């Protein structure tokens, strides 16, 4: 009955579950997860051969997220490992499979950094998101 507060591991696992369920169902609402100074890169590839750079905000990450069509995405998580970091933040490492538009499942590797909003207790926003398919890099 002792309420306590969520551990970093449980927080990270809950965030992974919430993030990928929302992405699979309503990708357009994904932009609500991030913040004003939230850096985001999601398996990009520019017209040069090197991985794409990262966005550093809200409007432009929403624009990127619309740029990727992100329809009927199926995700299969093989590894979520979370730990505590500076300012009660949680650093999360995720590995698994992702498939967009019902294509073949491709191996993805990702790193989240969640930070507290401060004013509201037990509220976290995605300060950092680093996602790469290990097929356009390996």
């Amino acid at each position: 009955m002792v309420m306590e507060k969520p551990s970093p591991l449980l927080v990270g696992r809950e965030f992974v579950r919430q993030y990928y369920t929302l992405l699979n169902q309503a990708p357009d609402m994904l932009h609500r997860f991030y913040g004003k100074n939230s850096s985001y890169v999601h398996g990009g590839l520019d017209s040069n051969g090197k991985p794409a750079d990262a966005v550093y905000g809200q409007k432009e990450i929403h624009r990127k997220v619309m740029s990727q069509n992100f329809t009927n995405c199926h995700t299969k998580i093989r590894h979520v490992d979370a730990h505590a970091t500076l300012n009660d933040g949680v650093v999360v490492q995720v590995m698994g499979l992702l498939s967009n538009n019902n294509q073949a499942l491709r191996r993805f590797m990702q790193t989240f950094v969640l930070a507290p909003e401060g004013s509201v207790a037990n509220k976290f926003y995605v300060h950092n998101d680093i996602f790469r398919y290990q097929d356009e890099v390996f």
Binding site: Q18, T21, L22, Q25, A26, M29, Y34, A121, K123, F124
Partner: protein, 38 residues
Amino acid sequence: PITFGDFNDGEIESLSSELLTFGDFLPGEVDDLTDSDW
């Protein structure tokens, strides 16, 4: 109205009764977008 220490009545539950929340979604407002499934 039972209190312990010098804490005000209900202050304990006020501080400890914060559900785990993510992003800008309200608590319980992220699981509703994924109902009607199998």
